[PDB]
Amino acid sequence: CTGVRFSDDEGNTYFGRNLDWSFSYGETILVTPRGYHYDTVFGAGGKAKPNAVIGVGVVMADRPMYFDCANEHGLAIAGLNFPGYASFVHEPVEGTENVATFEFPLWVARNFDSVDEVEETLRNVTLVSQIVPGQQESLLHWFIGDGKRSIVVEQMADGMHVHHDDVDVLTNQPTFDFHMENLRNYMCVSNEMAEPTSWGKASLTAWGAGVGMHGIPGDVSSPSRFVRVAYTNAHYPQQNDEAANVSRLFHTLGSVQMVDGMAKMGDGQFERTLFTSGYSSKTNTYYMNTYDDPAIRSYAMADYDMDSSELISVAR
Amino acid sequence: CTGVRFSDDEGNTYFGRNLDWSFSYGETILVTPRGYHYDTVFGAGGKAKPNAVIGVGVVMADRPMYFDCANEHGLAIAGLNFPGYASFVHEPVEGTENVATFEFPLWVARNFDSVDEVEETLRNVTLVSQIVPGQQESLLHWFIGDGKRSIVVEQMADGMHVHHDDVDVLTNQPTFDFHMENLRNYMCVSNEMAEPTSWGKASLTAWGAGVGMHGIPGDVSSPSRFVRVAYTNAHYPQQNDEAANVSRLFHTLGSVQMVDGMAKMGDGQFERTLFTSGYSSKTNTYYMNTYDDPAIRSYAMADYDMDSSELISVAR
Amino acid sequence: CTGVRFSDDEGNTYFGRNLDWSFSYGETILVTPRGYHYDTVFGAGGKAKPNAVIGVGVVMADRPMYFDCANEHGLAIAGLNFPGYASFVHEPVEGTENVATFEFPLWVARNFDSVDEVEETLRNVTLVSQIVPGQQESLLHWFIGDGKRSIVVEQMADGMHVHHDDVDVLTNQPTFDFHMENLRNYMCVSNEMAEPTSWGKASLTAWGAGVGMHGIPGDVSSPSRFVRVAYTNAHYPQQNDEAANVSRLFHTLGSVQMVDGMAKMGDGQFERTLFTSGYSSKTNTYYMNTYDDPAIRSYAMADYDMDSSELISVAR
Amino acid sequence: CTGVRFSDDEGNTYFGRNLDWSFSYGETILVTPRGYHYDTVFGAGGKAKPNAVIGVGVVMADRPMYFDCANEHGLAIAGLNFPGYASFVHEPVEGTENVATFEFPLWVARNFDSVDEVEETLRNVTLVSQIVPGQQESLLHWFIGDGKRSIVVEQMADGMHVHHDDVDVLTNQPTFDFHMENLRNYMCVSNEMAEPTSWGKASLTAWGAGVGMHGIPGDVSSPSRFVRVAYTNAHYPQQNDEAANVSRLFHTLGSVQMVDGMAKMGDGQFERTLFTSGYSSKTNTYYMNTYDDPAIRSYAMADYDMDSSELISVAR
């Protein structure tokens, strides 16, 4: 998985994520209208008046289990895979806001309007994992963005770490700090045409474009994707209209896409970019394409009786 | 630019390309019916009854100048940029079949039914480059594929080189031999899960997928792209239906796409994958998407009257 | 800087380090005999009966300021550069063993016989940096080894971290954890002859030796040296005599040597491997060569009235 | 194997090589006085009065078979392994000067005073490889240097290639052209301190020296070694005295030495830098150290009577 955020000139949110796995089924654009009543697993609180939210997910037990989701005030949250690092308490803590790991995305998008607001509340959050005997625990870290900035939430054995994500990108393992240090290896990688230069008597020139970018890794490991996407996000020229920012988003992501055959998982199955989802706060629209179909599909929030009362789950 | 060929299990051709540049030239899907009368610039001969052809290209002086094209009999060709290496005579040679560099793709698609045929005729072909005030010579090499195999044509100052392209992939500079040697650097790159090993007492394990692929370059240089796409094409699992094979084609070419901001050219503009086109002989359909719109559009030779006699530019 | 440790069959200590900087002067093989009276800066304690120690260093104020040193019972300590990470209190803590940063090497080698012993005492050590107004603080981390194992001492803002160094190598920045995670990128690098393999129809073979090792970085940055030396240390065959282990040591180090012209520091001067020092516990001998002279010089402890009373400083 | 040439500011030759292999052949320092009578195997002509020569090699049938050697007039030559590419006729060609592959180094050192002279004569040289039951042909290429410049001789199935070696370096396979193209991948690798830059809001800085050199491969493959040593040789600051230049030579060759355990050959043995030799025309001295002993031994032509008439193997 890979998440990405950036902005336009008018401080609109563009937030996007790859969902990378061997296979997926049943997930859907899923609307949680303002009229839906939501009972929080461990009686965490929330706004008297909930935000409309849209995202990609499944409904388990008439609750929306979001991979990623965004609200009508430009705030977006994606959960990404983090086993080996992610580590949670299994009991609520008295006098903290106790949020079940799977509702966390919904919670943050129902109740907050900015990263500022989210970050502030996190200071008193416990992220409870409820263990199911047959079912393996979801072990994630979270990329959260609005039109100004992103943060990274890494709950681990030693506690909850909330990072300012100055490169506006996230992947998988290992820790955010590691990835940030690692970037420094690549600090000389450039998008400029390679300047002619000499080694002794030998004149070196670039065949063409991309030579200054040499040193960037091209494998689909988590750290390499982190670096490649960080580079691409940071060097993509600012855009100023919706069409171009959604293009930006989707090209940026998928610059670290996982193609069939590239890379097997632990079980010997090839990991693939099964879908790419995005959110625009300019249009409060969610977008999506899949491995089987690159045509981007849009899901305007205003489409969408947000004053309604039940989860809507839209197919195709 | 990048070219890719593979088959399915029924000997059908899947062939396609990325056209990387800073600006479009007005190219379009371009049908050349069998009834179109074509007079080869240097009087190269031809099939009594030409093959139908479709491709992406431009009309200049009522001649189709294809970037890439394919015929009804499963043969496809792309021209890719090759300055610094491509070098041609400007005058026909007596006794040879003299083919203008710009008509070469049309010429092959129209007159040959297989790579065997083409390869055979190339032994008596001269590739002639017309000087045009005060445009620069177009200095390309060509990737040619059918259901069985691909070849590479590099006409250079030392003569015409025709290579068997065992990796079914082509990029830009330098020579084909260079690239094939270069691959050997990456022969330990693996799509398998990296297995646990120790350095001294330190046990090393992979975070997850893609660590075995570590070593593959991630930049958009010509050689880096050749290696990435060769890898990707050689590891992608064989597929058995049109839609999976088209998806295979496009994701494969996506693995080496150029994203805005990655790499400037010599004029200071970013090189980008403006479009990606493809061909299936199963369906005799041409496919295409663009930087602006990843939705793949199809253009079946069926939907056009190949008995007709005029050039058809199809706007999209 | 780079430190290295390994062992033979008979559990003798081999410990070595590169000293890397633009220039050095006045350092010397320096013997601290058992008869020298040592007044510890902050009244840290120590054995009634001190270990003989030998090392490379300078004497400031009739005290031995050791770069690296080793004792007569096979324990060795090297300090390596760590600015940006290393961070110390400037006042002694009551009821801890307070050890001045510059005496730390001497302290550990005067008073301990094993890594076990050192590690145990560290649990109650404060590492005080005394600031001198003109003089910039020495900001190091420490590689410590005996014939069984090595540890790494990183005193930083958040406290003292003492790592088990399972790869038996240390360099400079960033943190030991980072370096350990980073190694995982290289876990497929092999010393085996690259097995012939095929990408599609194309057969790939190795030109010769070293192809399986491709993916190892070759620059002289701290992280790259860490990886390169870790690989070389872990893959070097065990040796069983002194000559061969000192060879092992010195080849291993210097596999990450810094050559003039390679790499400028912050001040624009080239960083070089100015000397390489080592220690054998089989012979309680210290060895050394320099940039200007690769001939290894030996300094047998028994040479060397260790029951004497003053620092000896041996030149050439 | 690796070869290196540079000068000082007075036009003197500094020339040397790493001989990488699994096992020694019994080579020694080997003096060939002007009085030694030599009958070229295929009757190649020669200077009326031959140049004195010293080198490292073996005596077989009372003929000196040099790995490398140099003459009193500042000209040096090394043979380096080149199987897969080196290919020779086995019979002399009428009218050419036919030189046995094993006598080629002796032959050049004896008869020529400069690279200009040699290059000139190579236009009429045939390199002949004697079949020997049931030894394998020695399949080398040659690096030839004086005070001004180096050339590379690659006799292959398509003919004899003589290259101007503008980087003053040579390794093994593949062809020289390959390597020179390959260098262009690394044209942004810098010995400068990597300067602070930002990716988005993330400020990237270097830990210290060597981050600008990031991208240089660290493995001991032939191509990786060519790139590392080309880099190192081209960036090493010009030096002006014998000792600094010899130190320059040896550290430069050390940057691509093979350490035990790094890389197996096809027989399963580790390839190692068995010895490193060098030459100075300033002093007409040959230099050498070995895997076992990094102390550099000198062998001045002065200390031998070049008017004598017998081969002198000097044991070390």
Curated annotation (Swiss-Prot), chains A, B, C, D:
Question: What result follows from mutating T2A?
Answer: About 2-fold decrease in hydrolase activity, but no change in substrate affinity
What turns on expression?
A: Is part of an operon containing at least two genes, bsh and glnE (GlnE is glutamine synthetase adenylyltransferase).
What Pfam families would the database entry show? CBAH
The answer to whether UniProt assigns keyword Transferase to this entry is yes
Q: Where is the active site?
A: C1 (nucleophile)
Which residues does the record give as deoxycholate binding sites? C1, R17
Q: Which pathway is it part of? A: Lipid metabolism; bile acid biosynthesis
Keywords associated with the record: Hydrolase, Lipid metabolism, Transferase
User: In which family does this protein belong, per the annotation?
Assistant: Belongs to the peptidase C59 family.
Name the chain's protein: Bile salt hydrolase/transferase
The organism encoding this protein is Bifidobacterium longum
Designated gene of the protein: bsh
